[PDB]
């Protein structure tokens with residue numbers, strides 16, 4: 001900063017947060033539920049081992065991973081989640097094989113005090129089944145061994161083209177094989193047994209399991225405990241005492257000197273000239289909206305994989321395009337186009353903060369970065385296509401294929417290329433910011449914090465390394481939930497708040513210090529408080545008690561920093577028409593209105609409805625997390641990047657008219673279509689399934705016996721009537737930007 005002090009203080013935030021990453025990966029490591037060495041059966045024969053568990057984990061990553069269904073509730077929703085259908089089916093196989101050698105009959109054919117005496121023998125056996133003090137053994141009973149090997153045949157038939165199971169495979173939306181080799185089936189069933197055994201086993205000393213008795217399961221007695229509701233109400237106190245103290249600290253710092261700055265009659269951005277490196281951004285804005293159209297079309301294709309079969313009113317080509325591939329594409333291209341629009345907006349604003357001046361050979365660097373981004377997208381999608389089609393031996397699929405985890409499934413070579421592209425954009429950022437801190441001035445307060453936050457976003461992406469493939473599941477989900485604790489909570493939030501502060505300072509609708517306070521707030525809440533909200537999702541996958549104590553109180557802390565609005569766009573907008581050129585910026589602003597609207601709809605109401613764990617116990621893995629994702633991601637950041645897209649369209653084609661009249665439809669159709677496919681189809685399905693999962697159980701909500709009750713069948717067939725409206729709105733937005741590019 002003054003003597004390269006502030007720029008050098010960047011390493012200290014990285015070091016503190018990386019010590020916090022190291023110390024919590026250290027506790028998760030070995031604080032995890034253990035993979036035992038070998039499955040010791042009681043008769044005297046051995047079973048499979050950690051090599052088979054690791055290779056079945058790799059085979060499960062090869063077939064889609066969390067894009068078929070889910071393990072422990074995090075993932076996909078149109079297939080039964082492996083941890084609960086296996087648990088319920090293993091339980092029903094055990095009751096059949098326990099009624100066999102005692103009565104010879106079925107389960108439900110017996111009376112209820114007999115079912116209760118077998119369930120109390122079940123809780124005499126399942127609440128104590130461990131190793132030799134993490135000694136690697138099982139001591140598995142032969143009755144449980146015959147039950148696991150009997151329910152093993154079901155999943156050997158679910159992926160081996162069984163002709164009697166077309167009533168289940170496409171009804172669960174898979175391709176006819178999904179895994180052609182037989183040892184791979186034998187290892188994927190061993191992996192499923194381990195994940196549903198680590199649920200069905202109490203923790204050492206305590207009476208709680210390793211995943212805190214994850215499904216609602218009365219037949220094993222999985223009722224959520226006392227400290228669950230205690231820490232839930234503690235989290236509610238933390239949420240309420242966070243919002244109020246932030247409003248109190250905002251109100252007791254809004255006491256300005258009433259400066260009242262006058263708005264100039266022109267726009268200080270358009271008064272300066274245009275570099276060719278600015279004029280070379282039409283290709284970026286084409287790639288942004290091209291990937292957006294690709295993403296909505298793919299989304300309509302997974303919509304038809306949800307309602308109907310794999311043939312699409314003809315003959316099926318889904319043998320080359322399964323459900324996991326189109327969901328990976330929908331998920332990765334969504335994150336990619338949302339990130340590239342903001343990356344383009346940042347590289348737009350970066351020379352203009354520098355008085356328009358540019359570094360040496362800038363347009364060529366912008367072009368190499370552009371072709372690098374298109375190359376990484378196409379290679380990642382080709383790797384996903386080659387990996388799901390089993391055109392890859394199980395050795396480079398982790399490196400050069402679909403990795404298998406939501407939002408991180410890109411291959412490690414393509415992840416290295418994406419990290420290198422983000423560092424090259426970092427280079428173009430420091431080449432635009434440096435020249436503006438080397439000048440003698442007094443604006444060193446906000447800009448050093450902005451440098452540390454941009455350095456943090458990317459230099460915490462060194463955490464996309466430091467995990468291999470052959471790792472434990474929960475350690476990975478600590479790291480998978482570390483990614484999305486910054487991939488949306490970081491430079492979508494913090495970058496779009498500071499870019500919003502730059503826009504509202506240039507329009508003069510902020511006091512140019514509340515922007516600083518907000519930026520300072522949205523900076524510090526994520527650089528100092530960015531670690532521990534991961535523990536609101538890891539509490540259901542391997543906590544101990546001080547981990548649960550930190551993760552309930554210290555993970556509700558991410559709710560509060562969002563909205564500077566309410567203090568603009570109701571009074572300042574009331575003071576509108578001061579400047580004539582605002583009629584060109586009516587629509588970019590409208591997006592900034594809608595940004596506020598789904599922030600009181602996505603996270604403002606449905607984010608704390610689903611946050612505390614006794615709420616989260618019955619819903620994690622149901623159709624209320626996509627309710628949160630769909631409303632939250634396009635509802636906030638899907639409008640932030642198209643408002644900036646629209647805004648840099650009006651700043652690179654100023655002579656080209658923005659052609660309104662259709663853009664009102666493209667805006668006021670997109671939001672309403674998103675609200676129609678969110679409030680009318682997905683949320684009622686989630687509440688009826690939620691009522692059935694608290695009534696009957698978690699296994700029941702994902703079964704095909706329940707999802708084909710012809711009410712929620714017609715309600716997801718009626719999902720389509722808002723989706724076509726959203727596609728029409730997106731189509732009109734796309735044609736508007738293409739006609740603007742001329």
Ligand code: HEM
Pocket residue numbers: 075076077078295296298299300301302303306330331334335338406623626629630633634638723726727
């Ligand atoms: C309007 C066209 C769209 C369609 C047809 C569509 C389709 C879908 C469907 C069906 C799901 C849930 C799948 C399931 O229940 O298993 C889903 C989830 C999701 N969609 Fe979309 N989508 C669309 C638009 C968008 C947009 C604009 C974004 C953001 C850029 C987006 C990002 C997501 C995300 C992040 C999820 C969460 C998936 C998960 O975590 O399981 N989608 N989409």
Ligand code: HEM
Pocket residue numbers: 074075406488489537558559603607608610611616620621625626628629630632633636637
């Ligand atoms: C505004 C920025 C945010 C966005 C864009 C966002 C988006 C998402 C998405 C897409 C998911 C689904 C992850 C998955 O695929 O499994 C998710 C998970 C979740 N979010 Fe957020 N979120 C945000 C902030 C928040 C806030 C502020 C809260 C609560 C205060 C919250 C609570 C949750 C919870 C409890 C889950 C778990 C759902 C699951 O496991 O599927 N999020 N978020």
Ligand SMILES: [Ca+2]
Pocket residue numbers: 074075076406
């Ligand atoms: Ca998911």
